[PDB]
DNA sequence: ATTTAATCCAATGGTTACAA
DNA sequence: ATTTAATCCAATGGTTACAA
């Protein structure tokens, strides 16, 4: 079992048997690299070429010895990486604030949803399109919970423009 | 069981318990329409929206009473529809030629591969990209056999440019 | 009382074995 | 001798039930 994450500020190294949030984000960067490698091979073989991080890419990460990578964990934190990509400044501020308050990782993760929904609102509530417009982010499936929140919010907003 | 197809020339109506090739191509147009309808609903519900004809679209076609549509048959003839889309003139000529010669449908279908491979050759051997550049065609998965032929051919051509 | 990662599941793209 | 469409299958995206 890997050491658990804790909330850290940008650049901070976590003390003890813990990992910090810059390490978490680096894990996404590593999966991206694995995808590039799977695409290179698929194209060279004339096989169908994935455009997202799939089960195919997780098997490849494992085979390459990155045993500390697994799908359930990457899916769990994808929306946190999304915020870091889409608005780094706001990602940084939210980390600093959660650290200073002594919150746990589970709590900080829940807080990442709201600013994403707000970004969606400024782009026609189309969050699939927001993801696809960012080169780092276009290869990640939109998490269901996040898609649900954007839809709930759009229905609340249109109910409100009936005024 | 639907009546079987036979090779016909553009505009020809098939006599007897038979269907012609314009009817076959019209079946693809109908699946496209079903996809548009599935996309409309997915987007309105904030659910993930398919970009290809999937199992989801075949279930929808059936439910809507288009019982004569089925996945195995649509996958079987997709490359023939591709040629009709990408180079209609050449599609027409090949039908006229196969009719006049008395060939069966299975035989005409095999002949559709070659001109597709030639189209791929003029676009960097990237047949996924050829499909995606045509609005009618971008929603169909590239059939495996066709992807294999384009790859075999590219390897033959690069072996040949060693001269 | 929290956080992690193995397990399981319905549905998928693709094919085979069969029927007419 | 041909042509059609039911059936089956390994692998997928997604989640749950569990362990540490």
Swiss-Prot record, chains A, B:
The record marks 48, 55, 59, 106 as: Interaction with DNA. Changing residue 95 to K: In lfy-9; leafy phenotype. Expressed uniformly throughout the young floral primordia. It comes from Arabidopsis thaliana. Forms homodimer when associated to DNA. Interacts with SYD and BRM. Changing residue 2 to K: In lfy-4; decreased in vitro DNA-binding affinities and leafy phenotype. Induction: Positively regulated by CAULIFLOWER and APETALA1. Down-regulated by TFL1. It is found in: Nucleus. Mutations in the LEAFY gene result in the complete transformation of the first few flowers into leaves with associated shoots. Changing residue 8 to M: In lfy-3; leafy phenotype. Residues 1-5, 70-77, 141-144 bind DNA. Belongs to the FLO/LFY family. This is Protein LEAFY. The chain holds residues 233 to 395 of 420 of the full protein.
